[PDB]
Design a protein around this ligand. Structure first.
Ligand SMILES: *C(=O)N1C[C@H](NOS(=O)(=O)O)CC[C@H]1C(N)=O
Length: 243
């Protein structure tokens, strides 16, 4: 509808302003990155990946045969932080529910060494996982920037990461979170509770098959629900005509 750039920029900054946080949303068309939001300098700062790490955690586990996509991870019967986690699930269900115990299990099956080696080989963030195989993505030392996250999403959306095509297709089928008038949104959220960072990193796949990667990165505040990350992302992507 021939909207100015100034006006797209202003509408998107105001989504972040109206949520009373600081954040950025990076979009990639082709090789070109565009940063929007109310705190542009966040784009190249380092944050914990938190649960966005599940995406690489799954790739690595599936590649190295530590799980299959059919395999049921049994709830062991301990009280878990949310009721939705007190059930048996597949890697894919666990991705939708962001179920830490399943992903911690998978990380322990991979083991620190194969994990350190594979995070180096795919060159994710600062690539340092420290000595603790089951929490490194939440409290350090692993860190990543919003630009590295959209680049990561871009790689995965186009099967360019160093993993078999089928492993990549298996993890991607797990990430479908929304369908809007012929578009599909694939993404993983993240919330570094261990200032708390919030992510939503992914791509939109358009009707015509074109794929536009994005990473939202913002500060999660006291009593904000996780779903603002989705609301701000849907509003930004629509404003830009991407969905
Ligand atoms: C991931 O960053 N986490 C796992 C779980 N679900 O997260 S989501 O809403 O960000 O998708 C709870 C919180 C968080 C964590 N503390 O590990």
């Amino acid at each position: 509808f021939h909207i100015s750039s100034q006006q797209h920029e202003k509408a998107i900054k105001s989504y972040f302003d109206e949520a009373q946080t600081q954040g950025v949303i990076i979009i990639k068309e082709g090789k070109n990155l565009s940063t929007y939001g109310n705190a542009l300098a966040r784009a190249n700062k380092e944050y914990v990946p938190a649960s966005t790490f599940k995406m690489l955690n799954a790739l690595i586990g599936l590649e190295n045969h530590k799980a299959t996509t059919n395999e049921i991870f049994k709830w062991d019967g301990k009280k878990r932080t949310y009721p939705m986690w007190e059930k048996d699930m597949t890697l894919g269900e666990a991705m939708a529910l962001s179920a830490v115990p399943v992903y911690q299990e998978l990380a322990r099956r991979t083991g620190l060494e194969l994990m350190q080696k594979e995070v180096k080989r795919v060159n994710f963030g600062n690539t340092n996982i420290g000595t603790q195989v089951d929490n490194f993505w939440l409290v350090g030392p692993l860190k990543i920037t919003p630009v590295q996250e959209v680049n990561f999403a871009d790689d995965l959306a186009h099967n360019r990461l160093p993993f078999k095509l089928e492993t990549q297709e298996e993890v991607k089928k797990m990430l479908l979170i929304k369908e809007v008038n012929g578009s599909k949104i694939y993404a993983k959220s993240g919330w570094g509770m261990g200032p708390q960072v919030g992510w939503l990193t992914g791509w939109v796949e358009q009707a015509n098959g074109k794929k536009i990667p994005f990473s939202l990165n913002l500060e999660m505040k006291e009593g904000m629900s996780g779903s603002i990350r989705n609301e701000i992302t849907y509003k930004s992507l629509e404003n830009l005509g991407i969905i």
